[PDB]
Amino acid sequence: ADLESLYRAMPSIKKLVDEGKLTEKDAEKVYEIWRNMEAIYKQASLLWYNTVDLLLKRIGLSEKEREEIFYEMVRPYFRLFSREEVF
Amino acid sequence: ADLESLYRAMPSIKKLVDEGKLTEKDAEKVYEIWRNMEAIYKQASLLWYNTVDLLLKRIGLSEKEREEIFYEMVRPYFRLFSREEVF
């Protein structure tokens, strides 16, 4: 049910496999990374809830207002950083 | 030059300080979190470049085609995870 979940989430990978360009073994690797990515990005929310969220709650901001500030903080980060930026 | 950079990037935080709701020390904490948050999104890009990007390179995909696949993989993660998801 792994690859099934993957192909649904990522039609591009399903296509590559159907096209014979990626093997099923390859697709299993991609699945692992897909799941791994969730764990990394979840860090951002965990950090948020234990730092700035608490500060904003303390000064009375509503849920919606606090969420808006989060997106203001991280929206520019919603991208694939270039190799030069990370390497 | 810290707080000035933060204020340019986060008008909402500048406003809260100007309104007297957030102290300057408060803003100093926000700066650090703002900076730290970037590393999380970089870590995800690093995993990409070291795994799936290599696979797709081998099979001949272009830089644009590979980038499209990255966004297909991670777009659902570009959000604030709920407290129930993380805790």
Side-chain angles (χ1 to χ4, degrees):
Chain A
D2 282 350
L3 292 188
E4 230 174 297
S5 308
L6 180 67
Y7 294 150
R8 175 181 158 188
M10 308 187 60
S12 291
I13 299 293
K14 181 180 172 60
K15 184 168 179 287
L16 284 172
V17 163
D18 290 348
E19 283 180 322
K21 294 176 181 163
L22 286 181
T23 70
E24 229 172 4
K25 299 273 183 55
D26 292 336
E28 293 177 353
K29 301 303 196 179
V30 171
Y31 170 87
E32 291 183 73
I33 298 301
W34 175 49
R35 294 306 199 195
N36 206 336
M37 289 291 176
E38 180 172 4
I40 295 171
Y41 288 113
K42 215 166 73 173
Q43 288 192 120
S45 292
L46 194 170
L47 184 61
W48 174 257
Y49 287 135
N50 287 287
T51 59
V52 177
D53 192 47
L54 298 178
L55 311 166
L56 297 179
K57 283 165 74 172
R58 173 180 120 250
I59 65 174
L61 274 64
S62 70
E63 275 262 274
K64 186 43 164 61
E65 290 163 346
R66 300 196 309 269
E67 168 175 326
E68 278 175 337
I69 295 184
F70 173 80
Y71 286 106
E72 180 169 298
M73 175 181 288
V74 303
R75 172 50 182 94
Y77 301 151
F78 284 174
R79 60 191 174 86
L80 177 62
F81 288 64
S82 68
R83 293 171 63 82
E84 302 308 283
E85 283 180 288
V86 299
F87 277 112
Chain B
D2 291 340
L3 296 187
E4 219 49 46
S5 291
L6 176 68
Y7 294 154
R8 280 188 297 267
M10 304 194 62
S12 292
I13 298 295
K14 173 172 174 45
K15 174 171 178 159
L16 289 173
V17 170
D18 289 350
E19 285 182 327
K21 300 170 187 166
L22 282 176
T23 77
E24 186 170 294
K25 261 213 63 181
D26 284 338
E28 294 182 351
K29 294 162 165 288
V30 175
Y31 172 88
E32 297 297 352
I33 299 298
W34 174 53
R35 291 305 192 195
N36 292 348
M37 204 78 93
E38 186 174 11
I40 298 176
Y41 294 87
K42 279 187 168 53
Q43 287 157 19
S45 293
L46 284 162
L47 178 56
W48 175 256
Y49 287 130
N50 285 273
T51 57
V52 182
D53 193 50
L54 298 176
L55 176 65
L56 302 176
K57 233 84 144 172
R58 300 186 207 130
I59 66 177
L61 272 62
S62 81
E63 186 178 7
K64 178 53 178 186
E65 292 163 350
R66 285 176 316 254
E67 165 175 318
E68 291 174 352
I69 293 181
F70 171 82
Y71 286 108
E72 186 170 287
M73 176 184 284
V74 306
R75 169 54 182 89
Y77 301 145
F78 287 162
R79 65 190 171 85
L80 181 59
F81 289 62
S82 69
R83 298 194 108 268
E84 197 55 15
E85 289 180 273
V86 301
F87 298 118

PDB file of all heavy atoms in Angstrom, chain A residues 52-80:
ATOM      1  N   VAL A  52       7.518  31.313  19.357  1.00  0.00           N
ATOM      2  CA  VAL A  52       6.785  32.518  18.989  1.00  0.00           C
ATOM      3  C   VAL A  52       5.282  32.389  19.246  1.00  0.00           C
ATOM      4  O   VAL A  52       4.628  33.356  19.639  1.00  0.00           O
ATOM      5  CB  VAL A  52       7.060  32.922  17.528  1.00  0.00           C
ATOM      6  CG1 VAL A  52       6.221  34.132  17.139  1.00  0.00           C
ATOM      7  CG2 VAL A  52       8.544  33.213  17.346  1.00  0.00           C
ATOM      8  N   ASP A  53       4.733  31.197  19.039  1.00  0.00           N
ATOM      9  CA  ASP A  53       3.310  30.992  19.292  1.00  0.00           C
ATOM     10  C   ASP A  53       2.972  31.332  20.738  1.00  0.00           C
ATOM     11  O   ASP A  53       1.931  31.927  21.018  1.00  0.00           O
ATOM     12  CB  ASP A  53       2.885  29.554  18.991  1.00  0.00           C
ATOM     13  CG  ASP A  53       1.374  29.388  18.969  1.00  0.00           C
ATOM     14  OD1 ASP A  53       0.701  30.223  18.335  1.00  0.00           O
ATOM     15  OD2 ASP A  53       0.856  28.432  19.584  1.00  0.00           O
ATOM     16  N   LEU A  54       3.852  30.939  21.655  1.00  0.00           N
ATOM     17  CA  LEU A  54       3.626  31.175  23.077  1.00  0.00           C
ATOM     18  C   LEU A  54       3.694  32.667  23.400  1.00  0.00           C
ATOM     19  O   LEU A  54       2.901  33.175  24.193  1.00  0.00           O
ATOM     20  CB  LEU A  54       4.632  30.391  23.926  1.00  0.00           C
ATOM     21  CG  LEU A  54       4.599  28.864  23.802  1.00  0.00           C
ATOM     22  CD1 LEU A  54       5.684  28.234  24.673  1.00  0.00           C
ATOM     23  CD2 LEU A  54       3.223  28.310  24.159  1.00  0.00           C
ATOM     24  N   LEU A  55       4.637  33.363  22.774  1.00  0.00           N
ATOM     25  CA  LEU A  55       4.781  34.804  22.961  1.00  0.00           C
ATOM     26  C   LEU A  55       3.527  35.533  22.486  1.00  0.00           C
ATOM     27  O   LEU A  55       3.034  36.444  23.145  1.00  0.00           O
ATOM     28  CB  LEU A  55       6.001  35.323  22.203  1.00  0.00           C
ATOM     29  CG  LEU A  55       7.325  34.583  22.380  1.00  0.00           C
ATOM     30  CD1 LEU A  55       8.318  35.006  21.306  1.00  0.00           C
ATOM     31  CD2 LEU A  55       7.891  34.821  23.769  1.00  0.00           C
ATOM     32  N   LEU A  56       3.016  35.121  21.332  1.00  0.00           N
ATOM     33  CA  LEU A  56       1.853  35.769  20.736  1.00  0.00           C
ATOM     34  C   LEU A  56       0.578  35.452  21.514  1.00  0.00           C
ATOM     35  O   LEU A  56      -0.281  36.316  21.683  1.00  0.00           O
ATOM     36  CB  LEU A  56       1.704  35.382  19.262  1.00  0.00           C
ATOM     37  CG  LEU A  56       2.859  35.813  18.357  1.00  0.00           C
ATOM     38  CD1 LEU A  56       2.619  35.353  16.925  1.00  0.00           C
ATOM     39  CD2 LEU A  56       3.057  37.327  18.424  1.00  0.00           C
ATOM     40  N   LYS A  57       0.458  34.216  21.987  1.00  0.00           N
ATOM     41  CA  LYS A  57      -0.673  33.832  22.825  1.00  0.00           C
ATOM     42  C   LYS A  57      -0.709  34.704  24.066  1.00  0.00           C
ATOM     43  O   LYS A  57      -1.759  35.201  24.462  1.00  0.00           O
ATOM     44  CB  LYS A  57      -0.572  32.355  23.222  1.00  0.00           C
ATOM     45  CG  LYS A  57      -0.966  31.394  22.123  1.00  0.00           C
ATOM     46  CD  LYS A  57      -0.527  29.963  22.406  1.00  0.00           C
ATOM     47  CE  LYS A  57      -1.366  29.295  23.484  1.00  0.00           C
ATOM     48  NZ  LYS A  57      -1.032  27.841  23.603  1.00  0.00           N
ATOM     49  N   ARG A  58       0.463  34.885  24.663  1.00  0.00           N
ATOM     50  CA  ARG A  58       0.615  35.656  25.889  1.00  0.00           C
ATOM     51  C   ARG A  58       0.113  37.089  25.745  1.00  0.00           C
ATOM     52  O   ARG A  58      -0.417  37.656  26.699  1.00  0.00           O
ATOM     53  CB  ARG A  58       2.078  35.654  26.355  1.00  0.00           C
ATOM     54  CG  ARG A  58       2.360  36.577  27.527  1.00  0.00           C
ATOM     55  CD  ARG A  58       3.824  36.526  27.952  1.00  0.00           C
ATOM     56  NE  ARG A  58       4.462  37.835  27.837  1.00  0.00           N
ATOM     57  CZ  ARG A  58       5.383  38.143  26.929  1.00  0.00           C
ATOM     58  NH1 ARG A  58       5.792  37.234  26.052  1.00  0.00           N
ATOM     59  NH2 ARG A  58       5.906  39.362  26.904  1.00  0.00           N
ATOM     60  N   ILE A  59       0.264  37.675  24.560  1.00  0.00           N
ATOM     61  CA  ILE A  59      -0.179  39.054  24.358  1.00  0.00           C
ATOM     62  C   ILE A  59      -1.578  39.139  23.747  1.00  0.00           C
ATOM     63  O   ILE A  59      -2.015  40.210  23.326  1.00  0.00           O
ATOM     64  CB  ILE A  59       0.834  39.897  23.541  1.00  0.00           C
ATOM     65  CG1 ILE A  59       0.970  39.361  22.115  1.00  0.00           C
ATOM     66  CG2 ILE A  59       2.187  39.930  24.235  1.00  0.00           C
ATOM     67  CD1 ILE A  59       1.832  40.237  21.224  1.00  0.00           C
ATOM     68  N   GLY A  60      -2.271  38.006  23.699  1.00  0.00           N
ATOM     69  CA  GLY A  60      -3.691  37.997  23.394  1.00  0.00           C
ATOM     70  C   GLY A  60      -4.118  37.655  21.978  1.00  0.00           C
ATOM     71  O   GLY A  60      -5.314  37.593  21.696  1.00  0.00           O
ATOM     72  N   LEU A  61      -3.161  37.431  21.084  1.00  0.00           N
ATOM     73  CA  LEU A  61      -3.507  37.144  19.692  1.00  0.00           C
ATOM     74  C   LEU A  61      -4.355  35.883  19.540  1.00  0.00           C
ATOM     75  O   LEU A  61      -4.145  34.889  20.235  1.00  0.00           O
ATOM     76  CB  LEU A  61      -2.255  37.059  18.812  1.00  0.00           C
ATOM     77  CG  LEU A  61      -1.726  38.379  18.244  1.00  0.00           C
ATOM     78  CD1 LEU A  61      -1.261  39.312  19.353  1.00  0.00           C
ATOM     79  CD2 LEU A  61      -0.598  38.122  17.253  1.00  0.00           C
ATOM     80  N   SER A  62      -5.317  35.935  18.625  1.00  0.00           N
ATOM     81  CA  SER A  62      -6.165  34.790  18.338  1.00  0.00           C
ATOM     82  C   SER A  62      -5.395  33.754  17.534  1.00  0.00           C
ATOM     83  O   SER A  62      -4.289  34.021  17.059  1.00  0.00           O
ATOM     84  CB  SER A  62      -7.399  35.226  17.551  1.00  0.00           C
ATOM     85  OG  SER A  62      -7.050  35.609  16.232  1.00  0.00           O
ATOM     86  N   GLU A  63      -5.991  32.575  17.388  1.00  0.00           N
ATOM     87  CA  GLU A  63      -5.423  31.501  16.585  1.00  0.00           C
ATOM     88  C   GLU A  63      -5.148  31.945  15.157  1.00  0.00           C
ATOM     89  O   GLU A  63      -4.072  31.699  14.616  1.00  0.00           O
ATOM     90  CB  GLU A  63      -6.371  30.300  16.568  1.00  0.00           C
ATOM     91  CG  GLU A  63      -6.226  29.365  17.750  1.00  0.00           C
ATOM     92  CD  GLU A  63      -5.364  28.158  17.432  1.00  0.00           C
ATOM     93  OE1 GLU A  63      -5.910  27.164  16.906  1.00  0.00           O
ATOM     94  OE2 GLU A  63      -4.146  28.204  17.705  1.00  0.00           O
ATOM     95  N   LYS A  64      -6.129  32.593  14.538  1.00  0.00           N
ATOM     96  CA  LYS A  64      -5.987  33.008  13.147  1.00  0.00           C
ATOM     97  C   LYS A  64      -4.871  34.034  12.981  1.00  0.00           C
ATOM     98  O   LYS A  64      -4.115  33.990  12.012  1.00  0.00           O
ATOM     99  CB  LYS A  64      -7.305  33.563  12.599  1.00  0.00           C
ATOM    100  CG  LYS A  64      -7.263  33.874  11.108  1.00  0.00           C
ATOM    101  CD  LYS A  64      -6.563  32.756  10.338  1.00  0.00           C
ATOM    102  CE  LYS A  64      -6.845  32.828   8.846  1.00  0.00           C
ATOM    103  NZ  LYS A  64      -6.362  34.088   8.230  1.00  0.00           N
ATOM    104  N   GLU A  65      -4.780  34.958  13.928  1.00  0.00           N
ATOM    105  CA  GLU A  65      -3.746  35.987  13.895  1.00  0.00           C
ATOM    106  C   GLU A  65      -2.350  35.400  14.067  1.00  0.00           C
ATOM    107  O   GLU A  65      -1.388  35.861  13.447  1.00  0.00           O
ATOM    108  CB  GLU A  65      -4.005  37.043  14.970  1.00  0.00           C
ATOM    109  CG  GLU A  65      -5.209  37.918  14.667  1.00  0.00           C
ATOM    110  CD  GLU A  65      -5.697  38.661  15.886  1.00  0.00           C
ATOM    111  OE1 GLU A  65      -5.270  38.299  17.002  1.00  0.00           O
ATOM    112  OE2 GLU A  65      -6.504  39.602  15.731  1.00  0.00           O
ATOM    113  N   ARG A  66      -2.237  34.382  14.912  1.00  0.00           N
ATOM    114  CA  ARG A  66      -0.945  33.756  15.153  1.00  0.00           C
ATOM    115  C   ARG A  66      -0.506  32.951  13.937  1.00  0.00           C
ATOM    116  O   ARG A  66       0.668  32.970  13.568  1.00  0.00           O
ATOM    117  CB  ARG A  66      -0.980  32.899  16.421  1.00  0.00           C
ATOM    118  CG  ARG A  66      -1.323  33.708  17.670  1.00  0.00           C
ATOM    119  CD  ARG A  66      -0.990  32.964  18.958  1.00  0.00           C
ATOM    120  NE  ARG A  66      -1.543  31.613  18.973  1.00  0.00           N
ATOM    121  CZ  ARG A  66      -2.739  31.297  19.459  1.00  0.00           C
ATOM    122  NH1 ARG A  66      -3.516  32.235  19.979  1.00  0.00           N
ATOM    123  NH2 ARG A  66      -3.154  30.038  19.430  1.00  0.00           N
ATOM    124  N   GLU A  67      -1.457  32.263  13.309  1.00  0.00           N
ATOM    125  CA  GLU A  67      -1.185  31.485  12.105  1.00  0.00           C
ATOM    126  C   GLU A  67      -0.739  32.391  10.960  1.00  0.00           C
ATOM    127  O   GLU A  67       0.168  32.054  10.200  1.00  0.00           O
ATOM    128  CB  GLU A  67      -2.426  30.677  11.704  1.00  0.00           C
ATOM    129  CG  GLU A  67      -2.364  30.049  10.325  1.00  0.00           C
ATOM    130  CD  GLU A  67      -3.572  29.172  10.029  1.00  0.00           C
ATOM    131  OE1 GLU A  67      -4.095  28.538  10.971  1.00  0.00           O
ATOM    132  OE2 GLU A  67      -4.000  29.119   8.857  1.00  0.00           O
ATOM    133  N   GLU A  68      -1.376  33.549  10.838  1.00  0.00           N
ATOM    134  CA  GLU A  68      -0.977  34.510   9.820  1.00  0.00           C
ATOM    135  C   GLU A  68       0.479  34.922   9.989  1.00  0.00           C
ATOM    136  O   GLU A  68       1.208  35.046   9.010  1.00  0.00           O
ATOM    137  CB  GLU A  68      -1.885  35.741   9.844  1.00  0.00           C
ATOM    138  CG  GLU A  68      -3.189  35.545   9.090  1.00  0.00           C
ATOM    139  CD  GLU A  68      -4.120  36.730   9.226  1.00  0.00           C
ATOM    140  OE1 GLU A  68      -3.977  37.488  10.209  1.00  0.00           O
ATOM    141  OE2 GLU A  68      -4.991  36.907   8.349  1.00  0.00           O
ATOM    142  N   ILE A  69       0.897  35.135  11.232  1.00  0.00           N
ATOM    143  CA  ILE A  69       2.274  35.540  11.499  1.00  0.00           C
ATOM    144  C   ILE A  69       3.256  34.418  11.153  1.00  0.00           C
ATOM    145  O   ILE A  69       4.330  34.677  10.611  1.00  0.00           O
ATOM    146  CB  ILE A  69       2.459  36.056  12.948  1.00  0.00           C
ATOM    147  CG1 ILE A  69       1.650  37.344  13.140  1.00  0.00           C
ATOM    148  CG2 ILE A  69       3.938  36.325  13.251  1.00  0.00           C
ATOM    149  CD1 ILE A  69       1.818  37.995  14.490  1.00  0.00           C
ATOM    150  N   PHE A  70       2.878  33.174  11.440  1.00  0.00           N
ATOM    151  CA  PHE A  70       3.694  32.028  11.039  1.00  0.00           C
ATOM    152  C   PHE A  70       3.940  32.022   9.532  1.00  0.00           C
ATOM    153  O   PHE A  70       5.080  31.896   9.078  1.00  0.00           O
ATOM    154  CB  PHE A  70       3.039  30.704  11.459  1.00  0.00           C
ATOM    155  CG  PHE A  70       3.752  29.480  10.933  1.00  0.00           C
ATOM    156  CD1 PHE A  70       4.888  28.999  11.561  1.00  0.00           C
ATOM    157  CD2 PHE A  70       3.286  28.818   9.808  1.00  0.00           C
ATOM    158  CE1 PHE A  70       5.547  27.872  11.080  1.00  0.00           C
ATOM    159  CE2 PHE A  70       3.939  27.690   9.321  1.00  0.00           C
ATOM    160  CZ  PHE A  70       5.070  27.221   9.959  1.00  0.00           C
ATOM    161  N   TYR A  71       2.872  32.146   8.756  1.00  0.00           N
ATOM    162  CA  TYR A  71       3.013  32.143   7.304  1.00  0.00           C
ATOM    163  C   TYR A  71       3.833  33.340   6.832  1.00  0.00           C
ATOM    164  O   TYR A  71       4.612  33.242   5.882  1.00  0.00           O
ATOM    165  CB  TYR A  71       1.647  32.069   6.608  1.00  0.00           C
ATOM    166  CG  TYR A  71       1.024  30.693   6.712  1.00  0.00           C
ATOM    167  CD1 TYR A  71      -0.045  30.450   7.563  1.00  0.00           C
ATOM    168  CD2 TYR A  71       1.533  29.628   5.984  1.00  0.00           C
ATOM    169  CE1 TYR A  71      -0.603  29.185   7.671  1.00  0.00           C
ATOM    170  CE2 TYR A  71       0.983  28.363   6.084  1.00  0.00           C
ATOM    171  CZ  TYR A  71      -0.084  28.147   6.930  1.00  0.00           C
ATOM    172  OH  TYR A  71      -0.634  26.886   7.032  1.00  0.00           O
ATOM    173  N   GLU A  72       3.678  34.471   7.507  1.00  0.00           N
ATOM    174  CA  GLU A  72       4.502  35.629   7.179  1.00  0.00           C
ATOM    175  C   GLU A  72       5.982  35.298   7.381  1.00  0.00           C
ATOM    176  O   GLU A  72       6.828  35.677   6.570  1.00  0.00           O
ATOM    177  CB  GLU A  72       4.097  36.838   8.016  1.00  0.00           C
ATOM    178  CG  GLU A  72       4.905  38.090   7.729  1.00  0.00           C
ATOM    179  CD  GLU A  72       4.293  39.310   8.373  1.00  0.00           C
ATOM    180  OE1 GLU A  72       3.143  39.647   8.022  1.00  0.00           O
ATOM    181  OE2 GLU A  72       4.945  39.913   9.244  1.00  0.00           O
ATOM    182  N   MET A  73       6.284  34.563   8.449  1.00  0.00           N
ATOM    183  CA  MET A  73       7.664  34.208   8.781  1.00  0.00           C
ATOM    184  C   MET A  73       8.276  33.219   7.784  1.00  0.00           C
ATOM    185  O   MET A  73       9.431  33.366   7.374  1.00  0.00           O
ATOM    186  CB  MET A  73       7.737  33.629  10.206  1.00  0.00           C
ATOM    187  CG  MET A  73       9.126  33.116  10.623  1.00  0.00           C
ATOM    188  SD  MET A  73       9.183  32.349  12.424  1.00  0.00           S
ATOM    189  CE  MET A  73       9.009  33.997  13.459  1.00  0.00           C
ATOM    190  N   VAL A  74       7.504  32.215   7.385  1.00  0.00           N
ATOM    191  CA  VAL A  74       8.083  31.089   6.653  1.00  0.00           C
ATOM    192  C   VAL A  74       7.756  31.020   5.162  1.00  0.00           C
ATOM    193  O   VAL A  74       8.360  30.227   4.444  1.00  0.00           O
ATOM    194  CB  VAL A  74       7.741  29.734   7.321  1.00  0.00           C
ATOM    195  CG1 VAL A  74       8.230  29.730   8.762  1.00  0.00           C
ATOM    196  CG2 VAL A  74       6.240  29.450   7.249  1.00  0.00           C
ATOM    197  N   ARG A  75       6.820  31.840   4.691  1.00  0.00           N
ATOM    198  CA  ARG A  75       6.450  31.802   3.271  1.00  0.00           C
ATOM    199  C   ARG A  75       7.644  31.903   2.321  1.00  0.00           C
ATOM    200  O   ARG A  75       7.714  31.170   1.333  1.00  0.00           O
ATOM    201  CB  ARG A  75       5.408  32.869   2.919  1.00  0.00           C
ATOM    202  CG  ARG A  75       5.143  32.999   1.414  1.00  0.00           C
ATOM    203  CD  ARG A  75       4.867  31.642   0.768  1.00  0.00           C
ATOM    204  NE  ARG A  75       4.654  31.730  -0.678  1.00  0.00           N
ATOM    205  CZ  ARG A  75       5.601  31.566  -1.602  1.00  0.00           C
ATOM    206  NH1 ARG A  75       6.858  31.310  -1.253  1.00  0.00           N
ATOM    207  NH2 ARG A  75       5.286  31.663  -2.886  1.00  0.00           N
ATOM    208  N   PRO A  76       8.579  32.823   2.599  1.00  0.00           N
ATOM    209  CA  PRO A  76       9.746  32.910   1.718  1.00  0.00           C
ATOM    210  C   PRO A  76      10.591  31.635   1.728  1.00  0.00           C
ATOM    211  O   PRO A  76      11.429  31.467   0.845  1.00  0.00           O
ATOM    212  CB  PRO A  76      10.545  34.075   2.310  1.00  0.00           C
ATOM    213  CG  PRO A  76       9.534  34.902   3.013  1.00  0.00           C
ATOM    214  CD  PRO A  76       8.551  33.919   3.584  1.00  0.00           C
ATOM    215  N   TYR A  77      10.378  30.762   2.712  1.00  0.00           N
ATOM    216  CA  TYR A  77      11.151  29.527   2.828  1.00  0.00           C
ATOM    217  C   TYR A  77      10.486  28.367   2.080  1.00  0.00           C
ATOM    218  O   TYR A  77      11.059  27.279   1.981  1.00  0.00           O
ATOM    219  CB  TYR A  77      11.316  29.125   4.298  1.00  0.00           C
ATOM    220  CG  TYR A  77      12.004  30.146   5.191  1.00  0.00           C
ATOM    221  CD1 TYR A  77      11.701  30.212   6.545  1.00  0.00           C
ATOM    222  CD2 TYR A  77      12.966  31.021   4.693  1.00  0.00           C
ATOM    223  CE1 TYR A  77      12.319  31.116   7.377  1.00  0.00           C
ATOM    224  CE2 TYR A  77      13.594  31.945   5.528  1.00  0.00           C
ATOM    225  CZ  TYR A  77      13.261  31.981   6.872  1.00  0.00           C
ATOM    226  OH  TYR A  77      13.860  32.877   7.725  1.00  0.00           O
ATOM    227  N   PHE A  78       9.274  28.599   1.580  1.00  0.00           N
ATOM    228  CA  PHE A  78       8.493  27.561   0.909  1.00  0.00           C
ATOM    229  C   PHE A  78       9.008  27.297  -0.502  1.00  0.00           C
ATOM    230  O   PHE A  78       8.306  27.546  -1.479  1.00  0.00           O
ATOM    231  CB  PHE A  78       7.018  27.969   0.826  1.00  0.00           C
ATOM    232  CG  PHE A  78       6.259  27.825   2.119  1.00  0.00           C
ATOM    233  CD1 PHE A  78       4.954  28.282   2.213  1.00  0.00           C
ATOM    234  CD2 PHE A  78       6.836  27.232   3.231  1.00  0.00           C
ATOM    235  CE1 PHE A  78       4.238  28.153   3.389  1.00  0.00           C
ATOM    236  CE2 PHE A  78       6.123  27.100   4.414  1.00  0.00           C
ATOM    237  CZ  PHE A  78       4.823  27.561   4.492  1.00  0.00           C
ATOM    238  N   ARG A  79      10.229  26.790  -0.615  1.00  0.00           N
ATOM    239  CA  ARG A  79      10.848  26.642  -1.926  1.00  0.00           C
ATOM    240  C   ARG A  79      11.998  25.655  -1.872  1.00  0.00           C
ATOM    241  O   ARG A  79      12.418  25.238  -0.795  1.00  0.00           O
ATOM    242  CB  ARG A  79      11.367  27.996  -2.413  1.00  0.00           C
ATOM    243  CG  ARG A  79      12.415  28.615  -1.501  1.00  0.00           C
ATOM    244  CD  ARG A  79      12.699  30.082  -1.877  1.00  0.00           C
ATOM    245  NE  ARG A  79      13.606  30.708  -0.920  1.00  0.00           N
ATOM    246  CZ  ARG A  79      14.932  30.639  -0.996  1.00  0.00           C
ATOM    247  NH1 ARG A  79      15.506  29.980  -1.989  1.00  0.00           N
ATOM    248  NH2 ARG A  79      15.685  31.234  -0.081  1.00  0.00           N
ATOM    249  N   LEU A  80      12.490  25.268  -3.044  1.00  0.00           N
ATOM    250  CA  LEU A  80      13.716  24.496  -3.126  1.00  0.00           C
ATOM    251  C   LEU A  80      14.865  25.493  -3.122  1.00  0.00           C
ATOM    252  O   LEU A  80      15.053  26.232  -4.087  1.00  0.00           O
ATOM    253  CB  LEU A  80      13.750  23.674  -4.414  1.00  0.00           C
ATOM    254  CG  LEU A  80      15.028  22.867  -4.667  1.00  0.00           C
ATOM    255  CD1 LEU A  80      15.246  21.834  -3.560  1.00  0.00           C
ATOM    256  CD2 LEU A  80      14.969  22.189  -6.020  1.00  0.00           C
TER     257      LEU A  80
END
